[PDB]
Amino acid sequence: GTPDIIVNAQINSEDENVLDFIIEDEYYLKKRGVGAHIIKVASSPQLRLLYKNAYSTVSCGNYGVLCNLVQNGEYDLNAIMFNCAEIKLNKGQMLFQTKIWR
Amino acid sequence: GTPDIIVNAQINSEDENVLDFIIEDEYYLKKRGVGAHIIKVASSPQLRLLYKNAYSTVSCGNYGVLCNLVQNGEYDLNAIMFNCAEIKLNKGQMLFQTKIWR
Amino acid sequence: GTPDIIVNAQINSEDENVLDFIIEDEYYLKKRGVGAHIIKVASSPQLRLLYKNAYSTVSCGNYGVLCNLVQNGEYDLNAIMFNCAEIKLNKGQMLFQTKIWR
């Protein structure tokens, strides 16, 4: 049972309608085939933005990310990562972004 | 080959721009790891709303749900569930929602 | 390690706000259970449209498709296919579409 990948949401520096999701700790996993990895998104007030408008998930690499809003409250997010290659994520690396269409 | 999870779409009571997806029958599945489960969405006229505007999928628990519109017609929907924990879904339970951005 | 499914984006004939994704080569794969298949989307200028507005992924069959925008540049797209049944994709067949909400 692989450990969860931890990210923290931050407002993008350039575009206020983009949330950056940063890797909290190094995560390296040399895997084989397309795997599913649970991503743990820390609750933060910035997340509320995702509950106000449509959005598009942006991948920062060779993998796909599935995001879902949560029924309860506006400060959480569910996310699963589908890796294509081997997992070599550095701390502080950007995993993904969500672009909000206002 | 696991049996499909069956849901029925209903208009949310509070927000007319939200479709609730209710579990038709009890589904319990004590699984290990992230699994993919096909969700069977019954055709219903209410689904048409998903073909008129953008939308966001809301998860009602510890799992992620992937929805796709279907090429043919406005009364269907494709959905796959990615469970994070063991599956303990009660009949009449809400699996997920789709929030439509008008 | 299954080979990637190759698609090419084209503007839909009827609706200029729809991108069609056509199968480049025949891909048949009699599989068992829900599998994940990496889809290889050729870079094309038409893709830029996905980076300008919200969109909805439309599935052309019995499978689900996960799309993600890419951090770098407006001419690429990430996509993973989750097959429900056995894979019998013909060359020139439409795999999926993306409907852009302007």
DSSP-derived secondary structure for A51-83: GTSEEEEEESSSEEEEEEEESS-SS--EEEEEE
Shortest CB distance from A59 goes to which of C1, C55, C70?
C70
Of A73, A81, A77, A90, the C-alpha closest to A19 is: A77
Q: How far apart are the first and last CA of chain C?
A: 39
d(CA C9, CA C22): 6
Instruction: Retrieve residue A52's tokens.
Output: 């106000």
3-class DSSP assignment, residue A17: coil
d(CA A99, CA B62): 24
From A15's Cα to the closest Cα of chain B, the distance in A is 21
d(CA C87, CA C4): 13
- Parallel, antiparallel, or unpaired for β A5-11 and A35-41? parallel
The angle subtended at Cα C102 by Cα A57 and Cα A49, nearest 5°, is 40
d(CA C6, CA A97): 25
CB pairs under 8 A between A and C: 50
d(CA B87, CA A11): 34
Contact present, C58 and B26 (Cβ < 8 Å): no
CA dihedral of residues A29, A31, A34, A40 (deg, nearest 10): -20
Flag whether residue B1 sits within 8 Å of chain C, measured between CB atoms: yes
The angle subtended at Cα C98 by Cα B4 and Cα C35, nearest 5°, is 35
- Parallel, antiparallel, or unpaired for β B54-59 and A63-70? parallel
Shortest CB distance from C54 goes to which of A36, A54, A63?
A54
Beta-bridged to residue C2, according to DSSP, are none
Which chain A residue is nearest to residue C39, measuring alpha carbons?
A: A84
DSSP assignment of C33-70, as one string? S-EEEEEEEPP-GGGGGGGTSEEEEEESSSEEEEEEEE
CA dihedral of residues B35, B36, B40, B41 (deg, nearest 10): 110
Contact present, A94 and A21 (Cβ < 8 Å): yes
Are the beta carbons of C78 and A56 separated by less than 8 Å?
no
Contact present, A73 and B60 (Cβ < 8 Å): no
- Parallel, antiparallel, or unpaired for β C54-59 and B63-70? parallel
Are the beta carbons of C58 and B79 separated by less than 8 Å?
no
Interface probe with B: pick from A57, A71, A72, A77, most Cβ of B within 10 Å:
A71
Contact present, C65 and C96 (Cβ < 8 Å): yes
Beta-bridged to residue B69, according to DSSP, are C58
Determination method here? X-ray
Q: Resolution, rounded to a tenth of an Å?
A: 2.2
From A26's Cα to the closest Cα of chain B, the distance in A is 21
Shortest CB distance from A69 goes to which of B56, B82, B94?
B56
Specify the residue for token string 């993998």: A63
Integer CA distances (angstroms), C71 to A58, A59, A96, C35, in order: 6, 6, 8, 26
Residues 6+ apart with CB under 8 A from B58: A68, A69, A70, A71, B96, B97, B98, B99
d(CA B65, CA A66): 8
Shortest CB distance from A56 goes to which of C1, C38, C55?
C55
Are the beta carbons of B37 and C34 separated by less than 8 Å?
yes
Are the beta carbons of C59 and B53 separated by less than 8 Å?
no
Residues 6+ apart with CB under 8 A from A14: none
d(CA B71, CA C94): 10
CA dihedral of residues A79, B52, C24, A63 (deg, nearest 10): -10
Specify the CATH number for the domain of residue C23.
2.70.40.20
Contact present, C23 and C56 (Cβ < 8 Å): no
Contact present, C87 and C4 (Cβ < 8 Å): no
Q: Burial-class residue B53 by CB neighbours within 10 Å (0-12, 13-18, 19+).
A: middle
Q: Give the number of other CB atoms < 10 A from CB of residue A82.
A: 22
* Number of domains into which chain A is organized: 1
Q: Could you say which DSSP state residue B42 is in? A: P
Instruction: Retrieve residue B40's tokens.
Output: 């069977």
Are the beta carbons of B60 and A71 separated by less than 8 Å?
yes
SS3 content of chain B, % helix, strand, coil (to 5): 5, 55, 40
Residues 6+ apart with CB under 8 A from B72: none
Flag whether residue B102 sits within 8 Å of chain A, measured between CB atoms: no
Residues 17-76 of C with CB under 8 A from A: 36-38, 50, 53-55, 66-71
CB pairs under 8 A between B and C: 50
Contact present, B101 and B58 (Cβ < 8 Å): no
Range of the domain at A37: 1-102
Integer CA distances (angstroms), C31 to B95, C37, C47, C85, C88, in order: 27, 11, 31, 7, 10
From B68's Cα to the closest Cα of chain A, the distance in A is 12
CA dihedral of residues B62, C50, C77, A1 (deg, nearest 10): -10
